[PDB]
């Protein structure tokens, strides 16, 4: 079989969208409050996550169709899914050799211990690292990686979504593209699409645990005052 | 004449309060988002001001009597006066030679141009620098400097204040201390108390101009997202 023209254009648009919103040089990281190694890494990681949310918003705005959704649906999707896209996109800096996220220099190498010093526990970081390891072992093509981020973003089964039918149809098209790409372009990937859909399930679980632990942070003003306005807004509970 | 015992204790408490909340080493400044020289200094100066608000809160909590005010009055006073205390306390880093605020190293030397790159204009920065120059020329004793900050903080004529009588009585006591200190301990200071009360008037005017320009910043989300939660809360308009 073969990929169609419109499927090809979708892949091209998503790859360009990711390249425009993920900077492999990580040179912007020097702008964040510096890392410190009670919650000494919270200022730096709050800034990193806030920066990453802006990038996910930029990526979302270039997913075909997402822009044509209502403003409310665009927000509903980003508020539920941003944390999952950040976990997905961070796989690009994750290193199997170091078991850490390496962002171009030792100051911006984050191990599990660094994240505990931002207020998180092993209840989140143990499944998150196992998630990153298994995702990294899938050896995803860049095409597959950006499709999976877009499919995750365009899930209609999230709280607050109104136009369920329209969003599901968009996600259905991307899933069709991903299945066809794997079948035609990924040698020996007969089990790959299923493994990727499992990763989407894993992300729901990581989402819930992160939300639990973020709630605890956001309820202590001495910690929440270290967050950014954008993090407060996107990870907050307003409707 | 002579200062009384209770006047002496007030001066001692205010000096100790200032020493505990103003760190002449400025070593905490490396924790801020770094300075960059559209509004390239806004992240760094937002962090500096947010840090300074915490210090003013710490100073306020050690003013005799301020703690025994209601929580609402404590907040009303800090929300109206914090910007003025920051302008007063910054005189300690202001340099007549450089016309700038020099905070222990060239990275943390702020000239007028640096502050314009945080969203402010000469309508604020011209009177502010003239204010700093004239205040610096008063050659205030440390005792006089901390009394003036406490008197500014304990002004009952600010919006939101409820127990007007109680706060005015506290401010009256501090004014009495300051007049007696100048008369007894400041040689040739016969015009000093009057010049200091004029500076309090100047600060009302600097307050209004800063509030004008801060409102403009806080109404543009691409700028307000660079502020801190504490700055948003203290300089915000909620009651």
């Amino acid at each position: 079989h073969m990929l169609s023209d419109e499927q090809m254009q979708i892949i091209n648009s998503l790859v360009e969208a990711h390249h425009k919103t993920y900077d492999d040089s990580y040179s912007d990281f020097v702008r964040f409050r510096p890392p410190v190694r009670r919650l000494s890494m919270l200022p730096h990681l709050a800034d990193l996550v806030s920066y990453s949310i802006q990038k996910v918003i930029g990526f979302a705005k270039m997913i075909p169709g997402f822009r044509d959704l209502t403003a409310e649906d665009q927000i509903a999707l980003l508020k539920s899914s941003a944390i999952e896209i950040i976990m997905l996109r961070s796989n690009q800096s994750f290193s199997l050799e170091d078991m850490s996220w390496s962002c171009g220099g030792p100051d911006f190498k984050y191990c599990i211990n660094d994240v505990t010093k931002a207020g998180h526990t092993l209840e989140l970081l143990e499944p998150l690292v196992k998630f990153q390891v298994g995702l990294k072992k899938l050896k995803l093509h860049e095409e597959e990686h950006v499709l999976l981020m877009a499919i995750c973003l365009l899930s209609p089964d999230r709280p607050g979504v109104q136009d369920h039918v329209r969003i599901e149809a968009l996600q259905d098209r991307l899933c069709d593209v991903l299945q066809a790409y794997i079948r035609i372009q990924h040698p020996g990937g007969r089990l790959l699409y299923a493994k990727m859909i499992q990763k989407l399930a894993d992300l729901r679980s990581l989402n819930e645990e992160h939300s639990k632990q973020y709630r605890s942070l956001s309820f202590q003003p001495e910690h929440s005052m270290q967050l950014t306005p954008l993090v407060l807004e996107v990870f907050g509970s307003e409707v | 004449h002579m200062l009384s015992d209770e006047q002496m204790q007030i001066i001692n408490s205010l000096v100790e309060a200032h020493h505990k909340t103003y760190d002449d080493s400025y070593s905490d400044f490396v924790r801020f988002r770094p300075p960059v020289r559209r509004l390239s200094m806004l992240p760094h100066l937002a962090d500096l001001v947010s840090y300074s608000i915490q210090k003013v809160i710490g100073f306020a909590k050690m003013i005799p009597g301020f703690r025994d005010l209601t929580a609402e009055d404590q907040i009303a006073l800090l929300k109206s006066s914090a910007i003025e205390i920051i302008m007063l306390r910054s005189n300690q880093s202001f340099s007549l030679e450089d016309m700038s605020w020099s905070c222990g190293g060239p990275d943390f030397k702020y000239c007028i141009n640096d502050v314009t790159k945080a969203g402010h204009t000469l309508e604020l920065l011209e009177p502010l620098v003239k204010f700093q120059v004239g205040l610096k020329k008063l050659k205030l004793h440390e005792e006089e400097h901390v009394l003036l900050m406490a008197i500014c903080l304990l002004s009952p004529d600010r919006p939101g204040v409820q127990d007007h009588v109680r706060i005015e009585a506290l401010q009256d006591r501090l004014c009495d201390v300051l007049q007696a200190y100048i008369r007894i301990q400041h040689p040739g200071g016969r015009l000093l108390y009057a010049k200091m009360i004029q500076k309090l008037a100047d600060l009302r005017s600097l307050n209004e101009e800063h509030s004008k320009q801060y409102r403009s910043l806080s109404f543009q989300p691409e700028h307000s997202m660079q502020l801190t939660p504490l700055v948003l809360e203290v300089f915000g308009s909620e009651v």
């Binding site: 802006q54 918003i57 705005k61 403003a71 665009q74 927000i75 980003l78 508020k79 306005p229 954008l230 807004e233 996107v234 307003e238 409707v239 | 543009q220 989300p221 691409e222 307000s224 997202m225």
Partner: peptide, 10 residues
């Protein structure tokens, strides 16, 4: 609400 999100979503 969502002042910053609306702005970023253009």
């Amino acid at each position: 609400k969502h002042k910053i999100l609306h702005r970023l979503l253009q």
